[PDB]
Design a binder for this molecule. Structure first.
Ligand SMILES: *[C@@H]1O[C@H](CO)[C@@H](O)[C@H](O)[C@H]1NC(C)=O
Ligand SMILES: *[C@@H]1O[C@H](CO)[C@@H](O)[C@H](O)[C@H]1NC(C)=O
Ligand SMILES: *[C@@H]1O[C@H](CO)[C@@H](O)[C@H](O)[C@H]1NC(C)=O
Ligand SMILES: *[C@@H]1O[C@H](CO)[C@@H](O)[C@H](O)[C@H]1NC(C)=O
Ligand SMILES: [Ca+2]
Ligand SMILES: [Ca+2]
Ligand SMILES: [Ca+2]
Ligand SMILES: [Ca+2]
Ligand SMILES: [Mn+2]
Ligand SMILES: [Mn+2]
Ligand SMILES: [Mn+2]
Ligand SMILES: [Mn+2]
Lengths: 233, 231, 232, 232
């Protein structure tokens, strides 16, 4: 065991790494993207946030991988006469990792061919002809903005979504679920991912989000609480 | 806080209440229903953890949040069909078994308030109340699930269940996944535990096999873990 | 892992096994011993255990569980009276029934039956025959004659905070007590081999007695308890 | 709740802040002080902290966190040499840099700056000016002059198992230590008001030093550590 666990019911920037537009509000909410002052989601916003202590996801000397689980509550709000864009994602990234492309890339990817050593679970609110399925989806991305697998997600605007993602070392099973307590709806997706193959032994852990790059496609991307836990060996 | 938590990676009958055909194998598997190596017909078995759990408090008016997880394995013999199902249930303390088959051992079809809440894994259609397909369903005092979801039963594969109840939102959420098939199903609805359940309940499983020859399955739990936090 | 954990910040009799005078008050306090007019009854004996048996060790795997528990008790002696006889946390055989009163804390006999009992006592009365001269915290293994002890400065009516822990690897049993009000603290530690004395499964809880003679009585109350055991 | 918990059964420098001679060995042991031969270097000073700041209290809600930590350390003195200077677990301000060597354990100055530091020391050397006569475990609050202490029978080369806990309600700080090999144990407890001395956020870890004179040196190694804090 080489355990870690934390749980923030209110955020503070002192134990967080914030990149670009990410910020913690006076009410302790992690706000991944900008407001344009009219209280409106800024266009072309990109923000990432990670927990400040690196986590060891696997060990090359023992050949072991960690199991983990995380849960968070997010709220995405689209202003009137506008559409959702571009999405939000929880990600496991390399330690000094810097932001990538805006919009459809969720700040996590490039469309170039660099190995990003990134794994993420996205909550995609906008269709990208080139790789996205037709409907808003939850998706497991492994080194590409082209989800290795997905599930239809019925985006409800302004309602709090409760996510629960888990990875089991033995079965290599990654499983993401989401539920709208207000609507009583729920969605789940699961596929096997081999963390050792794509991820470095140590990674920073957190969120990434972007708003559409064109006028009428913007949404707020806020996380209200988060809890992570990882057990290695 | 008035917490409880346990986790059995292997069962033993000393801290379990077994009813009817329930039993723990030499390998530590909770086997809810009977068998010469073939699932017995008309089998009924229930098993609960021996210490009652306080689900809610009338004096403080509070309800507990909880979560449980278990791995079960249902196996249908060749040239036979699945029947009747398996359910995780919260039941009154001295609760005794009810009807066989389609009632999963939990209900009657009479009008007694059973003060029972359960999440069923139904493997057989019962014209009178079941949906057409095999489903995961949330039952609140009735074998007629208050809500359900299509479940693609895979025979002999281990299913990993995760049920959770959140006191604040009253949200009950059941999910299942076949690590082998990489499939997953989820259901969620609001249940008010205070309304139907007594403050203290025994916690566990119930299962039955079909009452007619060709409808039988084994109903085995391989591991279980429960957790409840009151106040 | 074959874990268990619980934590009662207020007792209720539904998940407890009460023996003799043990009882839970309307305020949810486990009261191990009686009253007669609101004064600790003489010759009282009360035991209380958590209702689900705990597996302390496994003969097939040869493993032993590590555990920890913590509770807050309060012993109060009435005016012009002396403390007696004591309170103890014990690991006992599953259907175990009470033993002798007074100095035996309800856990022992003075006969030579193997009681398969292990307990940590909080002794408030000197028993010439086996007790040390001063009030002590003691580790008892199958005998009311503690295998080891430490001076305990009993403060009357103040809440004591106990913390007992057993580590499988080192076989180290360690008991400590602190009076948050007085800022005092006491600790004892010795190695005990649970496999040698205890059965694989045991009931877990408390036992307490009041002196058998008029002016030796105290109340024996537990206010909160928390147990945790991890096997393998 | 704004919880945190971690547990390292083997150290790696990637989630640690190391200062001066602190280093993680190939075997994953946090070695707070240097060597040379393989002898403890004289005048060594090393500090190590967990990389994410912990919030110890909140000015807006006025709440303080309860916490607990446990670690196993091993201090070894070379033949024909004496222990010096000590080891300490400390809660320090976030960017905090090292202080004086030897007797100051790297945590203090002897000047009159508020160090906003709270530490539990395992002092192996008497310092006429402020130390008690015997080797002690002590609670330091802003000064190398422990606010309270307890005799500690240092056993050379044996693994010591420490357990420190802080309870927000009672403000009680309680440190204990046991040598599973010797079966000895020691405990100290006093009330400390974290809000009064500590900033809301602090880095958490260890500090240690070796004697500044030839014959006074020891190794200062931590073999495992686990911290836990619950705020509100
Ligand atoms: C986080 O805590 C620091 C403590 O100095 C405070 O200045 C800051 O305002 C807090 N941040 C938020 C978003 O409340
Ligand atoms: C239950 O534990 C007892 C301990 O004595 C053991 O004899 C028995 O074999 C165990 N039962 C099972 C089904 O493993
Ligand atoms: C225990 O809970 C039951 C719930 O029905 C209640 O009637 C009883 O008063 C409780 N006992 C105590 C001692 O509080
Ligand atoms: C810490 O992990 C890194 C991962 O790159 C490895 O190089 C290093 O050897 C590890 N340190 C120890 C002391 O094992
Ligand atoms: Ca998209
Ligand atoms: Ca049915
Ligand atoms: Ca005595
Ligand atoms: Ca000194
Ligand atoms: Mn997508
Ligand atoms: Mn049904
Ligand atoms: Mn004694
Ligand atoms: Mn000192």
């Amino acid at each position: 065991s080489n355990d870690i666990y934390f749980n923030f019911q209110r955020f503070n920037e002192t134990n967080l790494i914030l990149q670009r537009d990410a910020s913690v509000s006076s009410s302790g909410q992690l706000r991944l993207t900008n407001l344009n002052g009219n209280g409106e989601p800024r266009v072309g916003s990109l923000g990432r946030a990670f927990y400040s202590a690196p986590i060891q996801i696997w060990d090359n000397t023992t050949g072991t991988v960690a199991s983990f689980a995380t849960s968070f509550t997010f709220n995405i709000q689209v202003p009137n006469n506008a559409g959702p864009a571009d999405g939000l994602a929880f990600a496991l990234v390399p330690v000094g990792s810097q932001p990538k492309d805006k919009g459809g890339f969720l700040g996590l990817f490039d469309g170039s061919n660099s190995n990003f050593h990134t794994v993420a679970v996205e909550f995609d609110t906008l269709y990208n002809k080139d790789w996205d399925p037709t409907e808003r989806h939850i998706g497991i991305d492994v080194n590409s903005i082209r989800s290795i697998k997905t599930t239809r997600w019925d985006f409800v605007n302004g309602e709090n979504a409760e996510v629960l993602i888990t990875y089991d070392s033995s079965t290599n099973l990654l499983v993401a679920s989401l539920v709208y307590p207000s609507q009583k709806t729920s969605f789940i997706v699961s596929d096997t991912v081999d963390l050792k193959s794509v991820l470095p032994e140590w990674v920073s852990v957190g969120f990434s989000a972007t708003t559409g790059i064109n006028k009428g496609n913007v949404e707020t991307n806020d996380v209200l609480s988060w809890s992570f836990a990882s057990k290695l060996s």
